[PDB]
């Protein structure tokens, strides 16, 4: 099972517990952006960020009140019609919102039982994507597959380091291709234990594709209320990649020396195959736009795997 | 039965009829589509070898000082980024794509590959979160025939076409309508089934290496490559790989039969074989500009992972 998150007074989480932290549901959230549950029907603000006020501008009561209707006019009937009661957790809506305080924000949405769950992060506003498509499809083997994957995301990202990190039958990770800055260690080659990535992680990450750590000294930000009002429950956050990390996790990256981090699955035949894993030696938020592109890069990557291993087997 | 290509009709090759169809060499007609400008280059010296006749009112230069001049004269920035990008030996399939600011013709698209020792250049003008929200949802299609419909009705808003359809082929290359989205009035192709021959062999084979063609006026003359033949072989220059391509005369001729202006199809390729098609139809000519033709590449991608995961879920 899972042990009670913290909050609800469950046992701090130690080396002889990983496989039973319950990272879906930390009740906190990254500080580079802000997040709103709300009720399906109504469009009722029920949790909110407690830096919300910062990125919309809104003195802290007027949101936990107010309606999305009257909150996003133009945005509360696409979200009706784009995520219809029963959808998964894994179906995102996104736009781009002009907000008068922040320039504009990204905003993505997705569903969870009777609650939407609505992500802000500033954002801004070319062919590096069609030609990395097309250099991915010739790449004649999945040796250089692995390598042209991720010089391509490393020139794409700016990334320190970017690794293609391949799970064996019995989950022992091993990085097989390496991009990185002149004067870093070299990963590639080495193979690391199971339990650096536990049991539940590596289900979360089948379902949902892609997450990061923005800044690995940030503290989290609580959702208040903590519980869901609906339930008297967790609100459950795996689903939303503003979700605040496992401390377990951040003391391994700063235990590293990484800054920055951020990982997209490789999804084969319904299992976790690999994961395209980011490292840089300073914070740094990469923009909703730029994670767009890595999240088709995961898709493309997911099809050319199965296509090279086919041609192997 | 399959049979070898018959030489092109330049060659001397013969005209092409319902009997001896599969054997059209629709790789190698020679010519393009006047919407855009296509010039073939020496792949180490950049030496500008063939050029299609309207390449002057595309670029604003006259042949002879085209022809005159090497790509590191005329493409200085984009010369050494082809060179890295297309190394010799890399695959016909393989594209490099940019965007250029010309003087006489505002933004154009370069697309590249590499044939060989020849570079082909081509050139067409060029022009928010639509393609992310149709990527998930694609992926949350419970079953096939859903994820037939939500990918033909996206193509659709889109695109704006007034037929998108997809066609799946069957083991003995006889096809069948499996969805559509269409246009108020336009009488349905769901459920109906097309023989083999209606896609020729050699064509199926084509469209398994190059993902997508189109045809943007089915009554626009092609426009001749000059000259016809590659002057490094006195051989046809391979157009398999070039968008601009001209279409076959048979299928412009099954098209205006149809009432149809323009054409564009992007290929589903699963386990190595060509599994549908996702064709669109519009009554009168369109030209979808090239980034737009980027998204189609991409769901044509999804697509392909879609199908095979969809169909997994299928014993
Ligand atoms: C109590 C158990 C421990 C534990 C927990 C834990 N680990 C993760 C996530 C990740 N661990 C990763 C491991 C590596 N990254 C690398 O670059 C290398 C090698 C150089 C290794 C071994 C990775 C990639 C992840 C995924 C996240 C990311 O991309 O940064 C989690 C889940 C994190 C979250 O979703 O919040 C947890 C709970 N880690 C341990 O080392 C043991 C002691
Ligand atoms: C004697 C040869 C004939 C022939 C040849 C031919 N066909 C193509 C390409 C296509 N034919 C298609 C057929 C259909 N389109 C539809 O919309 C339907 C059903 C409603 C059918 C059956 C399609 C979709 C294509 C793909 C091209 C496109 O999407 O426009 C070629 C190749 C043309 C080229 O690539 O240059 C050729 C040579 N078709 C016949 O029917 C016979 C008479």
Redesign the interface.
Known sequence: PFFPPLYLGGPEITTENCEREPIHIPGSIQPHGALLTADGHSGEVLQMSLNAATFLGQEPTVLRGQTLAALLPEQWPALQA?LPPG??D???????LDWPAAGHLSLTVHRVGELLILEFEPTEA??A???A???L??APNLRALAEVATQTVRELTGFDRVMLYKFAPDATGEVIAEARREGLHAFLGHRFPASDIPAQARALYTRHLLRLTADTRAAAVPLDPVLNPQTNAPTPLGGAVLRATSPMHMQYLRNMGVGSSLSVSVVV??QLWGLIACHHQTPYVLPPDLR?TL??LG??L??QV??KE?LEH
Request: hydrophobic fraction near 40%; aromatic fraction near 10%.
């Open positions: 784009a959808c998964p894994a179906l995102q809506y996104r736009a781009t070319p062919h994507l069609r030609n498509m097309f250099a499809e010739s035949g319904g767009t999240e088709y898709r493309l997911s099809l199965q296509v086919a």
